[model samples]
Target: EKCFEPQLLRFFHKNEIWYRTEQAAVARCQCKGPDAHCQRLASQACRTNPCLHGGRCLEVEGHRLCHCPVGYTGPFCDVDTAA
Candidate 1:
């Protein structure tokens, strides 16, 4: 599998609140999967940057699979992996 997008969606979602206020959300939301910024941000996550401690944010259906590193595991990267 080449793997995910809508993956970086969480961060972009974080910006949703602002989008509504600034009307930027409407600018993108109004479009049919053609928001330049939205698309860019989505692919950005797959490019890297999301998970902590060198982990990668590979998404999943039930929830996001943040492939965490040693000493940092779990969805939030809060659960200690190595004892």
Candidate 2:
């Protein structure tokens, strides 16, 4: 496929939790999920752990998708479904 542009991957997010080479990311521009070296490391967005109360963070399509715990709800899983 194509290599990721340095500028875009370099400063994709202003939060900057981790640093990676554009080449590095492009090297494995295929698989993502529980079986990746994080070539598509969208999980970096989870650096701040948007999900709460044991919710699982699932990075997908350059966005954060939180797998909330059974007792929680809402985008960040902050809502208490138990109550």
Candidate 3:
């Protein structure tokens, strides 16, 4: 196990949220069932939420995955404490 620094935790939180929003999304057909399209659209919107370290927005398994750039590796990639 690894300890998550404050910055890392923040980054991870952002990443987690990014991923979850996708899962929350509903298919177009589902939308007709019960606001499905609206629900899915909202999830897509959530993916736009910004994360630290200039990570790119992406979704996997209907979840968000943070793509941190070089010189960054914390949860949110904002912290430079990692070696």
Q: Estimate each model's TM-score.
A: 0.32, 0.41, 0.36
Question: For residues 20-54, could you state the per-residue lDDT of candidate 2 as single tens digits?
Answer: 22211322232232122334443333455677887
Top candidate (TM-score): 2
Misplaced by over 4 Å in model 1 are 1-49
lDDT of candidate model 1 versus the reference: 0.37
Candidates' C-alpha lDDT:
0.37, 0.45, 0.39
Off by over 4 Å in 3: 1-46, 81-83
Ranking by lDDT: 2, 3, 1
- Candidate 2 weakest lDDT stretch, 10 residues: 22-31
lDDT of 1 at 68: 57
Top lDDT model:
2
Sort every candidate by TM-score, greatest first: 2, 3, 1
